[PDB]
Design a protein around this ligand. Structure first.
Ligand SMILES: [Zn+2]
Ligand SMILES: [Zn+2]
Ligand SMILES: [Zn+2]
Ligand SMILES: [Zn+2]
Lengths: 379, 379
């Protein structure tokens, strides 16, 4: 092509400083080296994680950087040795890599591959330990090995999920984080059986995907917990059957749940990232078999606590990262299901904006009322 | 019999008040009421749980009381409705009941039957909410629903395990607590697979049962961890393949374990009851799948803490209560395995003494250099 083996100059939302507005810049995107894939990002969605690193609260946050991790697009070019994808292929860049060969990938116990982890965590590429982004010949850090707030991005081949070309890229971009995290918290991590009584803390995108997950798992009761009653009405469509606003109760929320569940829930899922709520999600679980899955990401230097009697008496404490899904092997399968009308994707999108409206999209996310905000990159 | 329907006067070691020595007193043991079983306790073993309540550190402790929960005996008589056991039957009285019919029993997810817990926790019988023991017409509280430090005890039928009459009762008394707790933590709670790498924190009786359980489960590495290096030699025989004394390392124990196992253990078992060591057992577990099982009972008020990223990144935190064994269905099975020479029982016994030697036995527990001490009740 016209850009194959060449430096690309494109539009990118750059986070120059933490807690400052994002500026749409003109950026140089280097071609892909060995094991790398240059992707044309057509649509990108904002996740609370981008805002967290943006705020300045993330200790692993490196500035200046190109944020974003939830996106879909097309392969512009591939580096040396890239065989699974070719130019023109429809793809989903994934923050969680899948080499298929390491200790983690060679076991059916996890999805947490660590092939590219070190590089990605420091805003660079594995092959040369450098960024593929520059403004005035100076580097701009990558983020989560994705950096989807740039029209053109360079990602490792092991983090490129090849999807059905007939699938709509303005919807499927969500299948890169929030939605699979929720579905997978239920299907892969918890393995919720039919008839199960479920508690969901937080009715945001992930909490709503945990609700769809539980409904598909054949849960008899999906209890939704949120300190904002406005979030209840929209939750019903996602399978939530009962609701509790902790603010309307003087006793701890776990105690309220235990009274409505006859000893507690079979499975609880905390989708806020609040350590105090993580404790409450554990304690609301039924004695002997109750299982709490931490879905939400908590702030650095904050601990979860409980009395060990809670675990001795049969409760289980676990968590999920990208809902246990293997990016390359399983994200295309999630796209096939959506196309077969087996799973929901569209229903999580409330807003469609343009890349130039990035700060307006961030504004809507800080307020917390909305669901997903899909940005059209080429407008 | 000469005692059927009658009040028995026998010997019992009675703890009149905390931390003071035990007194061998003559007691009135009332006959069994409906659903009750009167047992001739021939042999009783001492557990750290008896010492804990005896010390006065137990908020649920009620004095005066007859301690003891590890025993084997013969059924002297039964109350109305008792059909499972009959006079002369060899039995193990269990602190964990198994009604075979409640919510917990009807599920294959737990061994935590709660039918008799409302009475046993307050040192009484369910039928009249009163103790079956008295000295000078004054009640002596029951303990753990077993009170095995009395020559004769009255227990709920749902706690009476019917065993093989050829089994040595001076040996099988251990199958009432410690040994099954360790064996089961591995086989039932954790479900340790062949080739697994195991860490055992605490090389006492329970830790040694975990090691034996792990060895039978086909674990490739059994790492023993104890601050007392004198416990290492004897542990080998029980299956422990390597040892770490944390006093010999300036770095945290979890750090030392990961460094020696390439990311951490597959399963860790904390058999000390120390909340700081519980945190170390979780954090020494491998990313993606590592499962820590709390076996040791911590003191009241104490809390376990960790950063939620540990669970988000694949670690599992759980606990075991009597090794997840269902008392009446499974204790006979363990006795059969001991008779088949498939499990160790004898090897956990270091001393045999008499009921009059109870205070000497407790002195031996205080120092903690010994394994199990068995008291011959009729000498
Ligand atoms: Zn891998
Ligand atoms: Zn995300
Ligand atoms: Zn029961
Ligand atoms: Zn015990």
């Amino acid at each position: 092509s016209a850009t194959q083996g060449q430096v690309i100059t494109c539009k990118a939302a750059v986070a120059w400083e933490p807690n400052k507005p994002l500026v749409i810049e003109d950026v140089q995107v280097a071609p892909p080296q060995a094991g790398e894939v240059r992707v044309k990002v057509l649509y990108t969605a904002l996740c609370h994680t981008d805002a967290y690193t943006w705020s300045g609260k993330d200790p692993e946050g490196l500035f200046p950087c190109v944020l974003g991790h939830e996106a879909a697009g097309i392969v512009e070019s591939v580096g040396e040795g890239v065989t699974e994808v070719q130019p023109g292929d429809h793809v989903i860049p994934c923050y969680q890599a899948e080499c298929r060969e390491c200790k983690f990938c060679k076991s059916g116990k996890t999805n947490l591959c660590g092939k590219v982890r070190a590089a990605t965590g420091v805003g660079v590429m594995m092959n040369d330990r450098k960024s593929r982004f520059s403004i005035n010949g100076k580097p701009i850090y990558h983020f989560m090995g994705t950096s989807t707030f740039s029209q053109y991005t360079v990602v490792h081949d092991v983090s490129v999920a090849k999807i059905d070309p007939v699938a709509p890229l303005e919807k499927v971009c969500l299948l890169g984080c929030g939605v699979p995290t929720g579905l997978g918290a239920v299907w892969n991590t918890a393995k919720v059986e039919p008839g199960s009584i479920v508690a969901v803390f937080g009715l945001g995108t992930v909490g709503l995907a945990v609700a769809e997950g539980a409904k598909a798992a054949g849960a008899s009761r999906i209890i939704g917990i949120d300190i904002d009653s406005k979030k209840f009405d929209r939750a019903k469509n996602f399978g939530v059957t009962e609701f509790i606003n902790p603010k309307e109760h003087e006793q701890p929320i776990q105690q309220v749940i235990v009274d409505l569940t006859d000893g507690g829930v079979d499975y609880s899922f905390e989708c806020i990232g609040n350590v105090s709520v993580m404790r409450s999600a554990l304690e609301c679980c039924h004695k002997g078999w109750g299982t709490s899955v931490i879905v939400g990401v908590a702030a650095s230097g904050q601990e979860i606590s409980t009395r060990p009697f809670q675990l001795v008496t049969g409760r289980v404490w676990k968590g999920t990262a990208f809902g246990g899904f293997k990016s390359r092997s399983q994200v295309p399968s999630l796209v096939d299901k959506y196309l077969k009308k087996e799973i929901k994707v569209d229903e999580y999108i409330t807003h469609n904006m343009t890349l130039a409206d990035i700060n307006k999209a961030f504004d809507l996310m800080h307020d917390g009322d909305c669901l997903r905000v899909v940005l059209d990159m080429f407008v």
